[PDB]
Design a protein around this ligand. Structure first.
Ligand SMILES: CC(=O)N[C@H]1[C@H]([C@H](O)[C@H](O)CO)O[C@@](O[C@@H]2[C@@H](O)[C@H](O)O[C@H](CO)[C@@H]2O)(C(=O)O)C[C@@H]1O
Ligand SMILES: CC(=O)N[C@H]1[C@H]([C@H](O)[C@H](O)CO)O[C@@](O[C@@H]2[C@@H](O)[C@H](O)O[C@H](CO)[C@@H]2O)(C(=O)O)C[C@@H]1O
Ligand SMILES: *[C@@H]1O[C@H](CO)[C@@H](O[C@@H]2O[C@H](CO)[C@@H](O)[C@H](O)[C@H]2NC(C)=O)[C@H](O)[C@H]1NC(C)=O
Ligand SMILES: *[C@@H]1O[C@H](CO)[C@@H](O[C@@H]2O[C@H](CO)[C@@H](O)[C@H](O)[C@H]2NC(C)=O)[C@H](O)[C@H]1NC(C)=O
Ligand SMILES: *[C@@H]1O[C@H](CO)[C@@H](O[C@@H]2O[C@H](CO)[C@@H](O)[C@H](O)[C@H]2NC(C)=O)[C@H](O)[C@H]1NC(C)=O
Ligand SMILES: CC(=O)N[C@H]1[C@H]([C@H](O)[C@H](O)CO)O[C@@](O)(C(=O)O)C[C@@H]1O
Ligand SMILES: *[C@@H]1O[C@H](CO)[C@@H](O)[C@H](O)[C@H]1NC(C)=O
Ligand SMILES: *[C@@H]1O[C@H](CO)[C@@H](O)[C@H](O)[C@H]1NC(C)=O
Ligand SMILES: *[C@@H]1O[C@H](CO)[C@@H](O)[C@H](O)[C@H]1NC(C)=O
Ligand SMILES: *[C@@H]1O[C@H](CO)[C@@H](O)[C@H](O)[C@H]1NC(C)=O
Ligand SMILES: *[C@@H]1O[C@H](CO)[C@@H](O)[C@H](O)[C@H]1NC(C)=O
Ligand SMILES: *[C@@H]1O[C@H](CO)[C@@H](O)[C@H](O)[C@H]1NC(C)=O
Ligand SMILES: *[C@@H]1O[C@H](CO)[C@@H](O)[C@H](O)[C@H]1NC(C)=O
Lengths: 484, 489, 485
């Protein structure tokens, strides 16, 4: 009668890492990292994104003539913008607090255009101005959402306009000022000198004086246009007054939906899919809790780790008694209790320690996945030319948190793998020690892992041993008899 | 003649958590987290806070007529403010660099009001102006700490004012400019167009022009007042000069105490205590090194971890015998030590507890606890800050930084406690096994092990011999022949 | 006839720390922290730094009369500046976006002065203006890189000037405006009131109005000067137009080399070295992976840990069979097989488990060094008086990352030391257990960590025992006969 204790072995070829060892073969391994994407920019939960194409956000909002397909826009999930869009400010100029506006838009879904100041009310001015820098079929044109006020005859009466926000939600209004390149152009466009533009609401209050200087010709013109914006609250009023150099708005952008969104800097084109989260390189379809594609993602999907391998060893060592190696024969459990009697042999497994080990390993896996749900998520942000210190601060903070969490994940995986391998070895050793303890001195220890019984006993005796019910006082006299 | 080795079990029901097992019962556990507070706003080391109430900081410094109880305030320890104070700028307007002023005030204790420009020196102008927006008992009034200069008769001569800071410390000066809502109002109040307000110090150079615009009515007025500030260095001079639209200061605020304080956003009222540190929800009076009430605290008290439970296992496992050794469970009789060494002689018995291993294990566990506590004293402490409407990027940056550091440190603390529990339980098991192995080793082969954790001596010894075996002075050559003779039977 | 099992002991006096016990004596230890510097400021890879002395960046760029030794400056590796420089803006005033310019300079090597607007083209104005705030040898002087245009005779014609950047790289241009203290001074200097200064590029549009006010006297003057700057792109032109209060530039600064550099706030001078890594306190010359001198560093050299000692335990516990302690007479390896045959004895050491332990320890050391090479590196930054919140944010972020990484390193070292000591003890115990298992009952376990054979066998048999080729059916009969006695 022999009762050898061992561990199940198989033919898997999965390798894991450890603190003391590298490239170790195990039986069962669970991967936690996804490294594949389909390389397609496409829908999020059935709502298509907004594709600006060769357009900028400023060009979309001001109404660039080239960007005429964005005049009416349905609900969206995210915004796709090129890194250096070509169609931006048709007329050269600047946008004040552009990056703050982009940050505000990042969490704003569907807009709704409202005609707040029609073009027919300006009866004492000319509203048909345009420039060749914004040309359609060769003829001069202008922004679609704004009006350029100019002389009518030879006078420029004081321009007044007001809007009381009775729409129902918050509204965004954009206005501008014009800066000519000489006094002659100012006199030929507005018939006044020392003009002003005044805007006033319940919170904001500006009065801007046009600035005239000689400048290089950008897009053919030496003049510039300065654009500002504000957010108008419910039941609030905005007032406009100008003796000259006013670019009045015609539409305000009501905020309609709101939600979680973002702006993506991609060079791709919209295709037809349906994914759950989207990265600037492609979509992700996964159930694993980590990925290594791109830090900036939109939707609900795994955390980002800057690593190439994250494999958790949930099985045993693959080395083909337990002092020589594993057993290929066993298929039931994890720990070996070889059967060999006179009437027959067998390969029965142990149902006691196996369940405990499975529960412990599953608890460890779940704890590892659970400890990392509080990771750091990066959010896109834009910074101007004179804000390089802030940009460096943001970049360094994001990189530092990413490195910290990558280190944490890798160290946890390594330590858990080492603990798992040692845990299995200790479990097998403890089972062998318990068998030797219970059986006591009524056997000889062969050395390879099992005992040669000193007393002849049968199926009932040794399944009693397996159940931990061997009774030393029950059968020892014949053992001592055959001891001689 | 029979010795045994086991461990100690008791009646405790504290539960601890481990990286592999959940809700494991132990003998002794030490708590580290604190989850209670009195829910009262009260004193810090005997110094009461500055309770603004319904007033804002601008309303306190400018002298809003509703904030007349704060004209002279004593030394404070922190400032209590509401999220949306009702009484701020009674006359509508703005306040340039408000948040920088609040950041400066977060580290400034007791002020001292000094009359730098008396109201009576303006003998060529009118100083009795006021608005119904800041009205007391129906009649018009104005800010208590400022002067509104208007024309006297039909003339507004150039107004000049200087102050040389000989007060002995740094001074805070606040001025303003009035923006009317048409040209007629400007001519009715100052009798001039194209006016200016100029302020000049050694490091400050400004010249503001009025901005006339059509605006809605806030608190009944269409005009606005813009306020600015500066910090005057010692032995420095500040100059004022204006053709119109000047809201001149009358008092200057002198920094006197300095120290560590803060601005707390709360909606409660002051009460009677004496606390060591204060949170916006209450106060903590304990000695544990962790808490989970609110990230922003003023004073000296534990660090913040976003966890619900943090218990360290400083004891054995609790699996007592159902209905005599470590293979079955623990013994209730060991009240002297941690590692039991039950003995039983021919004439008597007992439950003596070992000493050499117990003291070493106690020292090790205490060192581990102290190391865990000491490794986490370099945590991240959150500091309150305020941001404007056009600074959302900066606010998001600050919020993300604080939240990320809190998450990192919470993860560190939780993982450390888990690993400590695992290794402590394994340590105790290994130490019991080591003691048993040492006893078996010294015993050599002069006993038959019963299996249940202990062996019955083949040689018949007495109290002295078995005490020597306990101490570790068992001599094989002295008592081997009789043992062999007995085992021959 | 008897063998024994043990480990190696010697007379080293290195102490390591562990999570369960402090100041443990070990045989072999490795240090990972550098705590020494030469206290000198000196060259980085053969290129000397730029020594500003008692001058600020603004003083160097605007041409202060005191900083006359920096008119021509060769290539550099880093910039030396004092906390409170003496010679800065000789004429009192301000510098717009000073910290952004310093950040731009933080990654810019060699400049090249280009004379863009000569001093002789202003044939309708007086260019010889000067002040006693910047005085050389008593007489009034001015900035060397700037021109002060005043009236000539009794007229101030409109002043125009343009430059087209054909130099071949980006060029930095600085201009200024003047603020007098009274209307009389403005009339004396320029003959016009309500003057303007206008600057225009393809991305910059500005119109500045002089601000006249009464101010205290700084450096003996009540006026102020405000300076601004811009970066000119290639093939882009800049236009200047003013009716007064214009401080025109004469030189532009072409960015010629670019690279990695920095600004270091120090008070020392330049000595002679050839270092690879420089700190504001001194230079570092080491191959260890960590240091604790100063967070700010220029060059390539170890990471910063805010700690006092970091020692990794490589060897065994140094206490002088394996139960009573280690052996002092073993020199070959770590785990030994002290044997004593009938005709002799010895102190042989095993060569199979020793290699495994050596490989494991080396892998652990290399791994510990490898995981900690993605640390956080601090970069110097400057903030103004009204940017206190940003400064506090930056300081708190840098400090927090420093503490996080210090904690990580310390915990790693402590846990690894515990694991190493336990690993060595377990390995020795495993060796003894495997020998005892292979010997089967043909042994009399003495207790002291080793036993006496029950069968008399020679050197070859003992070698076979040590090599794992011990044969039970070879010499068991005589052993049983002996044990029956
Ligand atoms: C010197 C002074 O304070 N004068 C007025 C003041 C200003 O004339 C102006 O309103 C600045 O905001 O305003 C006060 O007076 C007025 C009301 O009583 C009146 O019904 O409506 C006026 C506007 O049309 C004006 O508001 C005020 O602010 O209430 C007070 C004072 O007389
Ligand atoms: C063209 C020029 O530089 N002219 C003066 C200059 C200006 O007149 C003005 O001071 C701008 O700051 O200032 C200098 O002259 C003067 C002193 O020598 C005199 O004692 O006091 C003057 C003021 O009351 C004035 O400061 C100067 O800055 O020293 C030089 C030059 O003559
Ligand atoms: C903007 O419109 C709203 C409503 O259309 C105005 O609010 C009303 O004001 C009148 C004053 O004559 C009150 O009688 C109403 O009760 C108000 N309605 C609500 C819903 O509050 C508001 O006054 C207008 N804004 C301005 C500047 O006149
Ligand atoms: C502000 O007052 C201080 C003294 O209270 C002035 O400093 C003195 O200036 C005179 C110049 O005539 C010197 O003789 C004294 O030695 C100075 N005393 C001290 C203590 O420094 C200071 O000049 C005044 N400020 C202004 C702008 O005049
Ligand atoms: C600045 O100088 C460059 C180089 O001479 C000018 O670029 C040239 O412009 C002319 C237009 O008449 C073209 O024919 C050349 O081919 C251009 N040269 C290059 C290398 O592109 C540039 O126009 C000048 N700037 C201004 C404002 O005139
Ligand atoms: C009211 C208006 O738009 N007027 C004219 C403008 C301006 O006069 C300036 O040139 C500013 O661009 O410019 C054009 O001549 C041009 O060729 O761009 C078109 C147009 O006739
Ligand atoms: C496995 O990792 C070890 C590192 O110890 C390396 O030497 C070996 O080449 C690796 N093998 C493969 C197939 O990558
Ligand atoms: C995502 O992968 C699963 C595979 O489990 C597949 O069934 C599913 O169709 C995939 N999703 C899409 C949108 O193709
Ligand atoms: C457990 O036993 C102790 C004996 O000291 C006793 O004080 C305590 O009240 C008991 N606890 C319970 C819940 O019975
Ligand atoms: C203890 O933790 C276990 C987790 O395995 C949980 O199932 C059980 O409900 C917990 N008990 C209590 C009283 O919370
Ligand atoms: C703090 O609590 C302790 C109880 O441990 C109490 O003795 C002490 O008086 C309390 N301190 C205050 C200020 O209430
Ligand atoms: C070693 O460390 C211990 C801390 O447990 C301390 O008590 C002892 O003084 C230290 N010895 C030396 C020589 O530093
Ligand atoms: C740095 O130290 C090494 C010692 O290994 C020495 O050889 C080398 O010359 C030193 N470098 C300098 C610049 O002194």
């Amino acid at each position: 009668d022999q009762i050898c204790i061992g561990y199940h072995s198989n033919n898997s070829t999965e390798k894991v890492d450890t603190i003391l060892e590298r490239n170790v073969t195990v039986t069962h391994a669970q991967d936690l990292l996804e490294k594949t994407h389909n390389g397609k920019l496409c829908k999020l939960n059935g709502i298509p994104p907004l594709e600006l194409g060769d357009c900028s956000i400023a060009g979309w909002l001001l109404g660039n003539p080239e960007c005429d397909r964005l005049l009416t826009v349905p609900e969206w999930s995210y915004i796709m913008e090129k890194e250096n869009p070509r169609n931006g400010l048709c007329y050269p100029g600047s946008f004040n607090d552009y990056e703050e506006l982009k940050h505000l838009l990042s969490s704003v879904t569907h807009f709704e255009k409202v005609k707040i100041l029609p073009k027919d009310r300006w009866t004492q001015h000319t509203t048909t101005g345009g420039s060749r820098a914004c040309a359609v079929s060769g003829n001069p044109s202008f922004f679609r959402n704004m009006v350029w006020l100019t002389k009518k005859g030879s006078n420029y009466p004081v321009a007044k306009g007001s809007y009381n926000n009775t729409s129902g939600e918050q509204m965004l209004v954009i206005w501008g000022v014009h800066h000519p390149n000489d006094e002659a152009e100012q006199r030929t466009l507005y018939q006044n000198v020392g003009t002003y533009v005044s805007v006033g609401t319940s919170t904001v209050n500006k009065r801007s004086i046009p600035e005239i200087a000689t400048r290089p010709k950008v897009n053919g013109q030496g003049g510039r246009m300065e654009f500002s914006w504000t957010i108008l609250d419910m039941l609030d009023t905005i007032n406009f007054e100008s003796t000259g150099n006013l670019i009045a708005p015609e539409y305000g952008f009501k905020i309609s939906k709101r939600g979680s969104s973002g702006i993506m800097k991609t060079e791709g084109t919209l295709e037809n899919c349906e994914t759950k989260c989207q990265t600037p390189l492609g979509a992700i379809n996964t159930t694993l809790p980590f990925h290594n594609i791109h830090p900036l993602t939109i939707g609900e999907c795994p955390k980002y780790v800057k690593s190439e391998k994250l494999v958790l060893a949930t099985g045993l060592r693959n080395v083909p008694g337990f002092i020589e190696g594993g057993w290929q024969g066993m298929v039931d459990g994890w720990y070996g209790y070889h059967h060999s009697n006179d009437q027959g042999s067998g390969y029965a497994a142990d149902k006691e320690s196996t369940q405990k080990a499975i529960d412990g390993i599953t608890n460890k896996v779940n704890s590892v996945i659970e400890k990392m749900n509080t990771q750091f998520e990066a959010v896109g942000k834009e910074f101007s030319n004179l804000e390089k210190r802030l940009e460096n601060l943001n970049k360094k903070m994001e990189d530092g948190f990413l490195d910290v969490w990558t280190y944490n994940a890798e160290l946890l995986v390594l330590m858990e793998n080492e603990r798992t391998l040692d845990f299995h070895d200790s479990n097998v050793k403890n089972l062998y020690d318990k068998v030797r303890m219970q059986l006591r001195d009524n056997a000889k220890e062969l050395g390879n892992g099992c005992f040669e019984f000193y007393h002849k006993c049968d199926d009932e005796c040794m399944n009693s041993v397996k159940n931990g019910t061997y009774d030393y006082p029950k059968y020892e006299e014949e053992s001592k008899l055959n001891r001689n």
